[model samples]
Target chain A: NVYITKVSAFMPGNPIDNNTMESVLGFVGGRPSRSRHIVLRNNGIKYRHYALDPETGEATYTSAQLAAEAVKGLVDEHFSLDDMQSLAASSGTSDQIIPGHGVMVHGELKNKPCEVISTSGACAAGMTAMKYAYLSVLSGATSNAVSTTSEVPSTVLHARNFQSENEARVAELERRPEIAFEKDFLRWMLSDGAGAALLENKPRPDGVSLRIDWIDIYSFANEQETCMYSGGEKLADGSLKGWAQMSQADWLAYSVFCIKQDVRYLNERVVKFTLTEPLRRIVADRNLSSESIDWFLPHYSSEYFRMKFSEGLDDINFSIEQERWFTNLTVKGNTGSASIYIMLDELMKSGKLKKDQRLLCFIPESARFTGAFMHLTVV
Target chain B: NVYITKVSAFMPGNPIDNNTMESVLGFVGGRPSRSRHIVLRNNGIKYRHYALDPETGEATYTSAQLAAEAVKGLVDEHFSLDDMQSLAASSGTSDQIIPGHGVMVHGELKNKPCEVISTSGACAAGMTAMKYAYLSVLSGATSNAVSTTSEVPSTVLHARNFQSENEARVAELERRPEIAFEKDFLRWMLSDGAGAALLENKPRPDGVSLRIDWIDIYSFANEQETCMYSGGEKLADGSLKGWAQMSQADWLAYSVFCIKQDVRYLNERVVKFTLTEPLRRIVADRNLSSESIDWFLPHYSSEYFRMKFSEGLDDINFSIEQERWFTNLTVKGNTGSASIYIMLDELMKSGKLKKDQRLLCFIPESARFTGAFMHLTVV
Candidate 1:
């Protein structure tokens, strides 16, 4: 079965609400403030709740359900059975729908055959989907998976200064205090959009392929304090807020430490852990160097994060352009788990893959870091 | 120098417009209104005046001058220089800007480059662009090209509408009347969105591929007396009124005629023009037969158009799914010249291309009907 075949990315096609920012500042009755920071704070609070659900073993909503819910929330209407049937038929998912749920219920059905994964931080739902797809293909299991994540509420609810429970409710639900500055920034970046791909088991085509040989996932429990975010209710209006209280200086230091640990883990166990002893014996019989992989697909939280993590990897050449093209960190901000799939899609569409090429996917989910390696041959 | 590589398609990330059909009707308001008929009438008048401009050999004002005047007239007072610059840039005509000319200068710059093709029919542009790109590659002139046709007022005014001189003092502008109905359908389809692709000369990695070797272009100029339209006029109250008309039966008949002509032209050319010579060569080289070609890309106008066209082609294999995916007609309406490009992109993304695969592109343009042949190969 082909692990990775095709990928795509999409975002809502509208501008950020500038009026909301003006209103917020006016409500504070102060000088103009940075919008990005405000967005970050709002998002942090909203997504913290999302992270907790999976952590608490309460992720009862399937991927399709989450997607449907998101869509319904955006459109503000109950999806009719006819609409559900139409969408399912159009998407070739008619046989996949389960009873007793809306179209969103289909997400659960699709994901049922696959394993559930979790991540730390906002937009984890999307990233978990990517991780599930990657691992499934690596393990020679399913070929396609759907992922989802939520936008920070501050970004989604772009109304100014009306002391309503919506803001407080979102904050309380997410269980994260807001970081005023990050909230401002995230408000501009966290666009509400979802992407789905149908992966098939096929070899990478000639001259255009991305191959994954092995992936090493790692987490720095020691640095958890430095990377963790806190949530609280604001005293002024009881609105929710989140703060990245860890200084940038400390985050950078811990990031470096994590990279060293990741590299060490990959160097020591990748050959054995990724290929398995039997697979390695077969490879050895064929005289293959597992390190001859052509592409490295890594998750990047930010440019700063990338720079810090890639400080000493002189021998490996990865395209930052792939990250730039696929992930909307600059435009849609950081979309937690969805970033990995986005990057993969970008690399594929930009004509960067080659036939029989080997690729490595590095994933950094909160709580635990894991990596999976798989090979792709273009058909 | 790659001519055709891989392509993909994406759906619009938003709901379909609710006001498209209503808007078109309002624009072409008349008792017992018909969108197709009213639009054609206006188009006839516009084409007549346009033809007259060349015959008179007089210049009350150049096309560029009229366009500039239109821009100035429509520009809002609050429009900024930056906004004008951005608009000009998006029109693919930054060089055409005159300091005082405002945005209208873009019209004169339109259609200057071989790359700058335009169409007035809704949903047709996407397919037209695809055909043009395929032809450009087959002729060995260009490897990859993007054909984009939009129903946007700016794109239409610049690329399709024309200003004709009636007297030295005032010029009568001629616009295609048929476009009103098409425009209405397109307005229903317009999504403030655009699609593009990178076509190159490369082999399909591990997907089905189509090869084009022999082709024919056909035009059926059968006139329809039943369908016509008139342009709206500005009333003394400063409101614009009286716009479009249509006849469903006439449109259906024309659609059938076009499809019939397309098949007839291909069959005749294959036998008479030695059109199969190249196809035979490709088949011999690939060790395949005529029955092996797996897919057909067609122009998309509407569901009615596709059904009628398919009915006219008794023994040919085609699917509405192909048109639906490639052109996104239901969502984007008719994008004129951009429709073909949309189709091509969809084909590439569908994971259907294979090495030495044979493919056919059928293109129908206003006053012109053409087809181009291409084969998929690895880079």
Candidate 2:
């Protein structure tokens, strides 16, 4: 049986506490703002890491560099990159890849001319990457493979960009426009991190062996506009333009477009589609019972959704004790697709999730309402 | 067996002839720019298409619209999008996905829900999309799926990026300074088009079923910098930025940054990997001889690569006669990842290829030196 031999993460720079996030965003004491308060209160984030250097107040490493750092954790004594048959990666932004087997070299494995499949799944990309690699290994195409997720959202999240056209957007916010983009929220909600997992046909004695079961990914692409978007703009010419179409001065004001609509998409209908219904059907198809699972690895947008998701799960007759379910969302912030692997890594290192238990991992595309549900048996 | 049920294409606007392309690029009779003439000579394109309207020279359709137009080809009495389990898309930029089954609805094939996998593989992305969908069905994850490659380069290709710092890039080129991005070559090299393939577990009774035997996707991401990139640039701060970091005026300069270096990567490794090695290995792995193949569907950079790629195949002891091989590069131009499916669609419609023949499809990512070799049996 194919198993996930290792799970590891690399978080960059210092962890930014909630207080630090507020201070950095100018939401300090006596600085009350509506959206800021909404994010601060409802998002349920506590602390998150940034690849930014405190000294210069700029990013210390690129997204790829952070991925490179995280990939280092997967370095194994037994596995060598020189023999890797294929590689798969996902990121919301640039994933620094060095040719001639750079990722594995970073993992201390080497690659000569490995094949690759890359995805830009945005929020669910990490899971997408993992699914690609898992399928590759499952199909008997390759004996071993690696999947990775890296993100340095600090480089793109521009809540405080006071430049040019954004000057109006900044000023207009004083009146609290109802439909404005949620730059302030994501600036605090998202963070920088990288995660990697090694999958092999056989278990490694030193590492946890996670027998793979199934990975299901789905999308509600019709709601894509309701969540998050940066560069897509409809033009007067009956076409679309301006997402990446630039300006040194003007559109830079409100250029970094996102949505305040994610909350609406998370209502009962979406929650059920993304989790409950899928879980019910997947369990039925796989002939798995709730008793077959002992641990839950859930990646939620925020702790605010805990009740909603929990209630939704209960509706489907699936349940997990608070102790059996593990998440680092509050401490890790929303690290995009990197969150699930991070949770897996941190929980494993805590020595709480022992061998012999089955794990159910839920990875979601929070921004656009897609999802990946995974099941693993621990050995 | 998993098979391709249908393949089709959508070329936006009218066919653009080489003289018309030259006229549109402002490279009329006497301009005689060096690299422009070289591109005009070396690139094996004569007639291509762009999605731009003739009068305004503005894009008439979005990438999604083009995708929708082409997706019409896959609709049939035997199959419809209502039964699809997944959707996969790739492009250099903007697949125009609206989430939650919009693509099928666009083609009048309703879907309760479907999963999506997206890739941004520039020139090679179409093949990536196909590879992804292939894997999804190959793994029995989905019984039916659609893969699409949609690119409206006219929306992005800034031959006349009239808005901002492009004003300077446009003028600076008049100075004809030697060291500059190849706005000239790609302006001629790329065009607007979309291609889609409907894949299913069962072969269509009316259509020729192509049973896929092997698919290999390799990357030289180290050479990623050597070929094509859309959103990337070196900032004055010594850091490289593109995509997310930009101003209205400044980023327009390199918003669609691509290559002046594709020819180099092609000649050295991409051609061989895409053609020779895969043929050698697939022949060995499947225990078959090249005599089994009757048709060659090749997506190449230019007809200039024809002789070179064939020589590499000869060097590797692979044999395929010129008459057996087929391509649309000379007339269709290089349509990026959309080219392969377009070639397949046109060849099928031309009624030249017969049934029961083995088709070796070579999809090359010469821009950054990646390739996907797919062996299919035409049933």
Candidate 3:
């Protein structure tokens, strides 16, 4: 058994409200983005953090630095950096393609040599790291582990990314000017932050700890096509043409490196595959019911999916009342893989989780549609 | 408990010889490479596979396709696609920056929904995936798991990657047209391939099975700087300037996306931290000695490290005889993360192992110097 003794989060600079988002991020086509208001309305995110300097437009922190800050916060009365025997890290993407995210965080901490692994994915990646740490401790591989998810999505949300689109499609821009909803909307939805959780074989002596019961992750890419993607373009036949196949000119022209989503497809299938289908089986396997879960922490991208998620649960004969659902999406925005950790930090620090409480976390990744669920008991 | 019931490997297309390597990959600056022969002569790699079309200079396969092909080989008598309840994939670097390599491979396989994870790093990423699968099965999370590693290093090795260097440094090229040894040496050492291993809670009823005893990974990045890296440049102060920090022109000019290593730093510390130190702890913890190991599979980057590796082992008071060491680096080149699986595939197919034999595998990743060691018993 493994218990999450502590949770810490670093959200970079002060939170930027909806009105200040584009001013900080700048305009993609030298004008206000057309889809910003629409996305903001749907997402219901009033405040989000950015790692970029507002006046200078320079990055204040890299992904590793953000992760390091969160890790620093993890050290407290019961734990020290020296107690970390294993480190597992995850990100939507990383600062570098080599060295792995976990080792980079290890480098930043300057801690002693230890076991490390970096997991890759989008939102579900956070729980992936958590599960790795949980299993490492549970299997007697280590006495304790540190798992983290850090995202610098602001690095990609800048106006500079759309330079090629503006220059190459001046004629098209003259008519429309704003980027498509798929690309422009993400600027308002995603933010920069990092979260770290300490997992140990034993619970904290003084404070409450969340005992990890189980974590399950499922990928539907075997049936679904790439819905949200980066470093590639999706073809008409539902296949991805990877970055390696494109020319430099083509890379920039298509904004192939930018993260994008097929919102239409996401709406059509996300609720069914990501929530209902997986929960149906999990509920049956665990013989769980809505009454068993004290808190349902769902990391949905937007408020637009709130009712839909609950409805999907109802369809599976497992319905949690709206009062039982908890999320900080409106305040924290979608920090991608780091959202769950950040959410847990807020709830844990708020003293909302009492002893013997059961919490279920749901993380959904639209980048090829993967979902992860974890059951934790407050001890 | 978990057992590696089967191992499979796929090397794309036909192998290219040393003399034909330049002709197939094309030459930078329309001339033969300066470091190819020197690097090849030292590495002891005679033939390697490339996933590119020699005639058109086009890619024949994506990294996912290569991995899917290797996974296809895992299905035979006892195992089927349905039996793969979990998949763990890793790479030195993936074809895309998002979606994770595991989900992409799942997309290519088009099998069924399953639990999946993608691990990141350099060479040791293979064993990282293996350990995830091992633990997942060991913990009863899954009855069987498939782990894979696919590397398409040739994606960066193509001559097109050097166009910017040749164009911007025409003046410098006249004096010395060759790329730096840190960058150029890797082209001769790395190759393209994929490897997959199946881990099951139950041993195979027939044929020999390797029962996994333990898998341990350690990172020395706390004391070391970035030695091997991509998507960034190492600075004077040993800090990395990531790709997001660079301009488009700067990205190409410096080949900021290319994989490079500090060969001098690597040679100085790789043997010490990646092998000797980790092995010392593992040996003492497990009461391991040369006499206990029947076959030692060491995944060193080249023949250049053979004597150095043995010397390092002797320093730790644990030295295995050269006759017991097994590797296919001469014919297969260095396939990075996939090399160990390929080696195991070759050894298992050779019918050299008998019951009650012990095998110890060592995998060292120079990307920030992480080492993995796994001990298995044949049954």
DockQ, all candidates in order: 0.01, 0.31, 0.79
Candidate 2's docking class is: acceptable
Worst 10 residues of 2 chain A by lDDT: A96-105
Candidate 1 or 2, higher TM-score? 2
DockQ measured for candidate 1: 0.01
Runs off by more than 4 Å, candidate 2: A22-34, A95-110, A159-162, A168-181, A222-225, A233-253, A256-273, A280-292, A354-356, B22-38, B95-110, B160-162, B168-181, B222-225, B234-249, B253-292
Question: Which runs of model 3 end up more than 4 angstroms from their true locations?
Answer: A170-177, B171-178
Give the 10-residue window scoring lowest on summed lDDT in candidate 1 chain B.
B92-101
Displacement of residue B146 (Cα, Å) in model 2 is 2.2
- Which scores greater on lDDT, model 1 or model 3? 3
How well does candidate 1 score on lDDT at residue B61? 32
For residues A1-379, write the lDDT of model 3, one tens digit per residue: 8999999999988889999999988887688887888888988899999999977888998898899899989998778887898889987858888889889988999888889899988888888888888888887778899999999988877888777777768855566556677787678889998999999999988989999999988898989888888888888998888776776667667777778888899999999889987888888888997888999999987989999988998898888999988888888878999999999999999978899999999998888888899999999
For model 1, residues A1-379, the per-residue Cα lDDT tens digits are 3234334443333323433333322331133544545544433322212211222322223333334443332121322212211111011011111110111233332221111221112222243233334434433333443333332232222323222322443545745323244233333333333344333344444334333333222122211111111221122342112111222222222221111112233334332322232233334544545455456555444453454334323223322233322333454434444455555656677675556655555444321122222334443
Tell me each candidate's RMSD, in Å, in order.
25.5, 4.7, 1.7
Q: What iRMS does model 2 reach? A: 5.7
Off by over 4 Å in 1: A15-31, A34-127, A134-190, A203-215, A226-298, A312-328, A363-379, B1-379
